[PDB]
Amino acid sequence: ATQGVFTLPANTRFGVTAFANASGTQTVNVLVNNETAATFSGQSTNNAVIGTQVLNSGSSGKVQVQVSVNGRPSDLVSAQVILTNELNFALVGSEDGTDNDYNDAVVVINWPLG
Amino acid sequence: ATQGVFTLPANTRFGVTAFANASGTQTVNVLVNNETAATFSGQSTNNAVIGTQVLNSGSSGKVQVQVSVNGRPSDLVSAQVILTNELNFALVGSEDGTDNDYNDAVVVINWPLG
Amino acid sequence: ATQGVFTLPANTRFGVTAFANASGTQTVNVLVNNETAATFSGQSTNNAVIGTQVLNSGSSGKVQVQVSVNGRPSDLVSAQVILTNELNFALVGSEDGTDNDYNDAVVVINWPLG
Amino acid sequence: ATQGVFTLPANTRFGVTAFANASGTQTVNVLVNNETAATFSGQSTNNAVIGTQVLNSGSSGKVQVQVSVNGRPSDLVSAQVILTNELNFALVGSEDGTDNDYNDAVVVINWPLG
Ligand SMILES: CO[C@H]1O[C@H](CO)[C@@H](O)[C@H](O)[C@@H]1O
Ligand SMILES: CO[C@H]1O[C@H](CO)[C@@H](O)[C@H](O)[C@@H]1O
Ligand SMILES: CO[C@H]1O[C@H](CO)[C@@H](O)[C@H](O)[C@@H]1O
Ligand SMILES: C[C@@H]1O[C@@H](O)[C@@H](O)[C@H](O)[C@@H]1O
Ligand SMILES: [Ca+2]
Ligand SMILES: [Ca+2]
Ligand SMILES: [Ca+2]
Ligand SMILES: [Ca+2]
Ligand SMILES: [Ca+2]
Ligand SMILES: [Ca+2]
Ligand SMILES: [Ca+2]
Ligand SMILES: [Ca+2]
């Protein structure tokens, strides 16, 4: 099943934050309406924030997260959770190797802001 | 129902990260085994990452999040999600006022690390 | 925070199913646009399905679950989960007593159908 | 990533419930410790409960859901969500074709019971 793709309300600002837990350098791309809107890279085995940004979901609301390590696409897991019918999380884990911890890059998207 | 209380794996490192989306200055307290282990604070209406820290869940694994604004406790919502039976997120929203956006302080706990 | 309230896409069919795990008879009311659209009741300590039905979310998409036992509303917990950006679950637990297992009536709403 | 595999607490009763939304007849097999413990089959495009049963997670706590149509395995998605640190839902969707609604068989596992 496709993972790392989310439909947000149109024209809405959202936060995106990435963490690293891996020997490999993680590259996280965030695409809005199929175009790159943010890119974070970094290396940590201690959950360091490797980037945070606020983006607008645009006319389509389509947001996609991709993760790669030295060009090799990571396998992704994802889901969206909504609390009290108001607060949205779109969550992504990724695996760059064999241990299947799926934390090598972790991406959190949250909305609404403000 | 009680919110913002999570049972983590014992003796295990986790990340805790807080975001602010409010006019009021937020204070987030993270308790491990009923003792304050981290405090974050800030003021942003644009998702500032007011704190992020790696903690150990200790012998009992009990982790609790509390949020206050100028000394008044905020109302909390929370849940835990698990992806691919391995990757864990404990999620907290909080409301300091009347609009019920529940994003005034947002806290994400993630494990495992490394 | 309010619990058991969900915004579905407008005019969309959804499933609603309730289970019982308690000594007392559970009455589950499902409201669409703030009117009772279905009512289920039954008693089980073994997760019996006490009702299942297909409903339409109507013009507003507003769906609410309420649970009553022994003449009093139960305390509710809830969340919505979306898998692969397609499959939606709106989940409700409820507590009628003192043990805080929150399973006394469990309600599952799922969409889309077909 | 692997989907449809959950680790439950050992020796614990849980509910498993399957729904169908597809032209193809769905077959759902629920494995406990790698042996089939329940099986449900049926065709519906209206969310029929093609089966619901109480099982015991046994010594291993390993529960796996498989879905097929006339022997052809469906693609699975899944996640687990925990409410108020107490109430567990393990969720499965499945896709037997090309439209990616992932609702062709939907399986919900809930615990604890009683
Ligand atoms: C050496 O192990 C670490 O690094 C690899 C490669 O980045 C990760 O897959 C793994 O989960 C660990 O974080
Ligand atoms: C002025 O409104 C903003 O600030 C208040 C007080 O902090 C929040 O409750 C609200 O959601 C907005 O973020
Ligand atoms: C005809 O379309 C229906 O049946 C196919 C095959 O079962 C499903 O994949 C699809 O989602 C619809 O439910
Ligand atoms: C048999 C018992 O019945 C009620 O007291 C419930 O609140 C308990 O959770 C338990 O199910
Ligand atoms: Ca890894
Ligand atoms: Ca890792
Ligand atoms: Ca607010
Ligand atoms: Ca706010
Ligand atoms: Ca109870
Ligand atoms: Ca009960
Ligand atoms: Ca399908
Ligand atoms: Ca279908």
Residue B96 Cβ < 6 Å to ligand 2: yes
Tokens in use for A21? 């837990």
CA atoms within 13 A on the CB side of D77: 28
Contacts of C79 in chain A (CB under 8 A): 81-83
| B60-to-B69, D9, D41 alpha-carbon distances in Å | 29, 17, 43
In the 3-class helix/strand/coil scheme, how is C25-79 assigned residue by residue? EEEEEEEECCEEEEEEEEEEEEEEEEEEEEEECCCCCEEEEEEEECCEECEEEEE
Contacts of B100 in chain C (CB under 8 A): 1-2
Subunits touching B (CB < 8 Å, at least 3 pairs)? A, C, D
- Distance of residue B26 Cα from the nearest chain A Cα, in angstroms: 13
CA D17, distance to chain mean position in Å, is 7
Q: Does C103 contact chain D (CB < 8 Å)? A: yes
CA A25, distance to chain mean position in Å, is 15
Q: Is the peptide bond before C9 cis (omega within 30 degrees of 0)?
A: no
Q: What share of chain B is helix, strand, coil (3-state, %, to 5)?
A: 0, 60, 40
- Taking the centre of ligand 1 as the mean of its atom positions, its distance from the CA of residue A104, in whole angstroms, is 7
Closest CA to B77 of B58, B102, B57, B52: B102
CB contact under 8 A, B1 and C100: yes
Measure the CA–CA gap between C44 and A70, rounded to whole angstroms: 55
Tokens in use for C77? 């917990």
What method was applied to determine this entry? Answer: X-ray
SS3 of residue C108 by DSSP:
strand
Measure the CA–CA gap between C86 and A1, rounded to whole angstroms: 10
From A89, which residue of chain C is nearest by alpha-carbon distance? Answer: C81
For chain D, the domains span: 1-114
Q: Does A19 contact chain B (CB < 8 Å)? A: yes
Stated in angstroms to one decimal place, the resolution of this structure is: 1.3
- Regarding the domain with residue range D1-114, which homologous superfamily does it belong to in the CATH classification? Calcium-mediated lectin (2.60.120.400)
- Taking the centre of ligand 7 as the mean of its atom positions, its distance from the CA of residue C78, in whole angstroms, is 19
In the 3-class helix/strand/coil scheme, how is chain A assigned residue by residue? CCCCEEECCCCCEEEEEEEEEEEEEEEEEEEECCEEEEEEEEEEEEEEEEEEEEEECCCCCEEEEEEEECCEECEEEEEEEEECCCEEEEEEEEECCCCCCCECEEEEEEECCC
Contacts by D98-101 with C-beta closer than 8 Å and gap 24+?
A: D100/A1, D100/A2, D100/C84, D100/C86, D101/C86, D101/C87, D101/C112, D101/C114, D101/D21
From D7, which residue of chain B is nearest by alpha-carbon distance? Answer: B85
Measure the CA–CA gap between D30 and D62, rounded to whole angstroms: 10
Give chain B's length: 114
Contacts of A79 in chain C (CB under 8 A): 81-83
Q: Which helix (H) or strand (E) covers residue B67, if one does?
A: strand B62-69
Nearest atom within ligand 4 for CA of residue C103: 9
Measure the CA–CA gap between D42 and A48, rounded to whole angstroms: 49
Write the burial class of residue C1 (CB in 10 Å: 0-12 exposed, 13-18 middle, 19+ buried).
buried
Nearest atom within ligand 4 for CA of residue C22: 11
Q: Does B1 contact chain C (CB < 8 Å)? A: yes
- Distance of residue D34 Cα from the nearest chain B Cα, in angstroms: 16
| D80-to-C66, D6, D88 alpha-carbon distances in Å | 23, 8, 7
Give chain A's length: 114
Q: Does D7 contact chain B (CB < 8 Å)? A: yes
